[PDB]
Amino acid sequence: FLSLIPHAINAVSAIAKHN
């Protein structure tokens, strides 16, 4: 459902947010 391109762009916040 295209729910793959906008997902990775969000995970980039977990890195930074996951510390």
Side-chain angles (χ1 to χ4, degrees):
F1 323 128
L2 226 81
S3 311
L4 215 182
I5 322 185
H7 175 22
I9 295 170
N10 186 5
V12 176
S13 198
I15 145 160
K17 185 164 184 284
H18 183 219
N19 182 202

